[PDB]
Design a protein around this ligand. Structure first.
Ligand SMILES: [Mg+2]
Ligand SMILES: [Mg+2]
Ligand SMILES: [Mg+2]
Ligand SMILES: [Mg+2]
Ligand SMILES: [Mg+2]
Ligand SMILES: [Mg+2]
Ligand SMILES: [Mg+2]
Ligand SMILES: [Mg+2]
Ligand SMILES: [Mg+2]
Ligand SMILES: [Mg+2]
Ligand SMILES: [Mg+2]
Ligand SMILES: [Mg+2]
Ligand SMILES: [Mg+2]
Ligand SMILES: [Mg+2]
Ligand SMILES: [Mg+2]
Ligand SMILES: [Mg+2]
Ligand SMILES: [Mg+2]
Ligand SMILES: [Mg+2]
Ligand SMILES: [Mg+2]
Ligand SMILES: [Zn+2]
Lengths: 81, 155, 99, 118, 60, 25, 127
RNA sequence: CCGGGCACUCUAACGGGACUGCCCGCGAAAGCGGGAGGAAGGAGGGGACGACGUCUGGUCAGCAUGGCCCUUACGGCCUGGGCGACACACGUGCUACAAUGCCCACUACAAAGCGAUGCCACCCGGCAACGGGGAGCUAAUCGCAAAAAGGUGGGCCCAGUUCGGAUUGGGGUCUGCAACCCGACCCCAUGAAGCCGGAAUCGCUAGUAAUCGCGGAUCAGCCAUGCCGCGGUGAAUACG
């Protein structure tokens, strides 16, 4: 963890701060899973990348301190049998 | 011991009672190379052989050892036919070693919580003859009893 | 009050250097107290012997820095000039200071 | 006598017998002992109902404990699951949450082994 | 290793974390002694021919 | 034992320092 | 004014100064029994005293460093052994059969690659 | 610490020293036993050292290199992922199951190595990781450093426990562009299996085995319990 910190990539932090004061909001795809989320992210739909594709994740307020990659899982399982 | 008669390690005599057989016993209480613990345990035993018993604890030791010393045991020999159990008497050297060993091994089986009391009481009970370590001695001589049948195969 | 610090990877030449500076000083001037070996500082490398995988079977090497100290109390301008021009070192290193 | 929830410790020591409560131990014990100014080497068996009430009333009040604690750790986990997050899946599927390695022994969190053929 | 790899190891900038020792004989990333800038195979190779100054094989 | 990081033995073994093995001499 | 000996066991080194008196012994500026307090074998450090019969004839000034408490002790033993044999070196008479004049060559054997502790070997597998 | 000496310890170069060379016994000799030597014997202990060859052994992924093969790609750059997956199965290990033990306090004794792009004394802030400050050292000259077991004192009283610390919740620290996947560390909480392990099976002959700590290489940091080393204490047992 960090504190003097709270790292977020400027790529989407741009387009998010932008989708606040535009008045309009829609579907935004980032490769940044290292970043942290919120507060102005909430209500937005971001497509994170698992290495394979961009997965839509709806953003709500208890998703807060979490990196984006937490909601975009990298592996595929479904068990053995 | 292919070539050699594999001669015996000579032990430096004790500091306090001044005896080889003590040290040889001390070493056998020694877990993981701690001698301090070994002797501080052993010596505390004689502290217990005193206020408890009136005799002179070294003398207990030399006796409880002599009581626990197996006179004959049964080892094995491969012959035309099966592998057997043949009675032979234990060498003087071996008597000692076996005795020292059982002494401790029985000792650490007794329930009394502290180390030095276990060796106290076992060395007492051994001396007086009713020791668990002595059970083993008898029980070994007893195996040499049963197989006195095959006693003609001895080397 | 001027002290010379000697280093090098070979003690056969190192000592053979510190020996020359002794009479590039002693005979050549004021008193200079004899060669004192400092402890040797040893870099060591222990490495796997073959290119692929045999993880036991390591060869190891070392690089040894040997140090030799010699002190000089009183300056003579023949000692100094000797210690400047008359240098005959090779793979040996040398230092000096006023302090 | 009994502190938060029921949780009766007894005999033994006092500062030890405090561990036996859910939410407390080692540190939190040796703490409330001098902040109610009670001897820790005393045995909960004997002591004034006075030092007993000072003791209960402090602990029960300072921090949350067995009932509400368990339910609070409970609720955190629930939140981690169902938010959809990755720490949440590993709670959902009963698997280890913090890095480590599931190709081999996860046993504590996987259960006993359930063997299969080759 | 490959060329673009032995190369890219020298173009060091962008986030100085990415820089990594690579051996200056091979191109070999793994087991590269800091002192020599040689990988473990080369250091055994050069040490043996007396081309490593004051470097002798030890024993004790 | 050497695996309890909350004791002197643990901390030493792990090589670290803290409230249970404070640095002093 | 005094007598001297050198001894070492296993990286431990001992300097032994023997001057006559009550028999007071000093180790590293400490009474023998404070420094070595509570150690079984301590009194075996000076055997050759009792063995040569000088009891309360000599005080002792001893410095010691290197190794560890218990190897230092056998190093001091060789000090007394060698010091005592300076004063009237007829003391060779009964010292050497007691063995007190020999140094213990026994030290830590090193560690060997592919082994674990230098003899101790990694567990065999076969499968 | 100062004067002062280096005598000793030591430091690190150079020689010395044991050769079955001496005595008795055997013996045809070579050797073998035994003796007294001496610090040391019967190659003193430990290295480095590995014959002609063997396994069509290992490695085209260190490198080199014949042949075959790809050529807007089988080459090249990037962002992210994966090598860290988990019903399970095996190898090598660390930590244990406790009272010759655990905890706290006080108190001792090492060696080998590393460090002025680093090692960091000492003071302050913080329970702490750590963060402020900040002197010394190109280093037998300052630092890493506390060695640990041990010792003394006190506590625990045989209990799944002051045993054991896996798991999980919360709170933070540091490196790093960045610690979701995948970091190490500190604190609070949580305290799992485990009460000496079926058939089976490994190591070790002496300063060894056990046991206790310490350094280094790689390295930003680190999954090191690994490896290569260092010394502390220190057994048992070999008829055959
Ligand atoms: Mg190439
Ligand atoms: Mg790197
Ligand atoms: Mg590298
Ligand atoms: Mg514990
Ligand atoms: Mg030495
Ligand atoms: Mg060792
Ligand atoms: Mg291995
Ligand atoms: Mg040869
Ligand atoms: Mg083949
Ligand atoms: Mg990439
Ligand atoms: Mg792998
Ligand atoms: Mg994993
Ligand atoms: Mg391991
Ligand atoms: Mg159970
Ligand atoms: Mg991760
Ligand atoms: Mg039990
Ligand atoms: Mg087992
Ligand atoms: Mg590192
Ligand atoms: Mg280590
Ligand atoms: Zn290379």
């Amino acid at each position: 963890s960090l504190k003097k910190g709270v790292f977020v990539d400027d790529h989407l932090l741009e387009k998010v701060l932008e989708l606040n004061a535009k008045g309009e909001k829609r579907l935004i795809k980032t490769w940044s899973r290292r970043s942290t989320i919120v507060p102005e992210m909430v209500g937005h739909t971001i497509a994170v990348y698992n290495g394979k594709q961009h997965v839509p994740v709806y953003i709500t307020e208890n998703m807060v301190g979490h990196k984006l990659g937490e909601f975009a899982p990298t592996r595929t399982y479904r068990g053995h049998g | 011991a292919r070539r050699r008669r594999a001669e015996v390690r000579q032990l430096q005599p004790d500091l306090v009672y001044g005896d080889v057989l003590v040290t040889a016993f001390i070493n056998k209480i020694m877990r993981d190379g701690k001698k301090n613990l070994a002797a501080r345990i052993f010596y505390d035993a004689c502290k217990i052989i005193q206020e408890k018993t009136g005799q002179e604890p070294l003398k207990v030791f030399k006796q409880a050892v002599e009581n626990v010393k197996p006179r004959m045991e049964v080892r094995s020999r491969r012959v035309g036919g099966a592998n057997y159990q043949v009675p032979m008497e234990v060498s003087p050297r071996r008597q000692q070693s076996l005795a020292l060993r059982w002494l401790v091994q029985a000792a650490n089986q007794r329930p009394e919580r502290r180390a030095a009391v276990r060796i106290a009481h076992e060395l007492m009970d051994a001396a007086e003859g009713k020791g668990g370590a002595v059970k083993k001695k008898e029980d070994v001589e007893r195996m040499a009893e049963a197989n006195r049948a095959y006693a003609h195969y001895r080397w | 009050k001027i002290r010379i610090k000697l280093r090098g990877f070979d003690h056969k030449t190192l000592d053979a250097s510190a020996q020359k500076i002794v009479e590039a000083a002693r005979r050549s001037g004021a008193q200079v107290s004899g060669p004192i070996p400092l402890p040797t500082r040893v870099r060591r490398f222990t490495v796997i012997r073959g290119p692929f995988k045999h993880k036991d079977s390591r060869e190891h090497f070392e690089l040894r820095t040997h140090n030799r100290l010699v002190d000089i109390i009183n300056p003579n301008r023949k000692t100094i000039e000797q210690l400047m021009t008359l240098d005959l070192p090779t793979g040996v290193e040398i230092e000096i200071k006023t302090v | 006598a009994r502190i938060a929830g029921v949780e009766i410790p007894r005999n033994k020591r006092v500062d030890v017998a405090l561990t036996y409560i859910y939410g407390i131990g080692k540190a939190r014990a040796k703490e409330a002992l001098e902040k109610t100014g009670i001897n820790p080497a005393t045995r909960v068996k004997d002591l004034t109902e006075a030092e007993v009430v000072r003791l209960r009333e402090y602990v029960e009040n300072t921090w949350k404990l067995e009932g509400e604690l368990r339910a609070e750790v409970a609720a955190n986990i629930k939140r981690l699951m169902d938010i959809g997050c990755y720490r949440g899946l590993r709670h959902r599927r009963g698997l280890p949450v913090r890095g480590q390695r599931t190709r081999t022994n996860a046993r504590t969190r996987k259960g006993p082994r359930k063997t299969v053929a080759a | 290793a490959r060329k673009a790899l032995i190369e890219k190891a020298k173009r060091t900038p962008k986030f100085k974390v990415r820089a990594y020792t690579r051996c200056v004989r091979c191109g070999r990333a793994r087991s590269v002694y800091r002192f020599f800038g040689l990988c473990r195979i080369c250091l055994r190779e050069l040490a043996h021919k007396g081309q490593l100054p004051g470097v002798r094989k030890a024993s004790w | 034992g050497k695996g309890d990081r909350r004791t002197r033995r643990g901390k030493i073994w792990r090589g670290t320092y803290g409230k249970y093995r404070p640095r002093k001499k | 004014e005094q007598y001297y000996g050198t001894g070492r066991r296993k990286e431990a080194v001992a300097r032994v100064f023997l001057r006559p008196g009550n028999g007071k012994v000093t180790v590293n500026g400490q009474d023998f029994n404070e420094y070595f307090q509570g150690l079984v074998r301590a009194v075996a450090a000076l055997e050759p005293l009792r063995a040569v019969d000088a009891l309360g004839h000599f005080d002792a000034y001893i410095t010691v460093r290197g190794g560890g408490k218990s190897g230092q002790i056998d190093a001091i033993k060789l000090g007394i052994a060698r010091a005592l044999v300076q004063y009237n070196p007829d003391y060779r008479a009964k010292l050497k059969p007691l063995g007190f004049l020999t140094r213990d060559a026994r030290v830590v054997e090193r560690k060997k690659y592919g082994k674990h502790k230098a003899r101790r070997a990694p567990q065999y597998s076969k499968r």
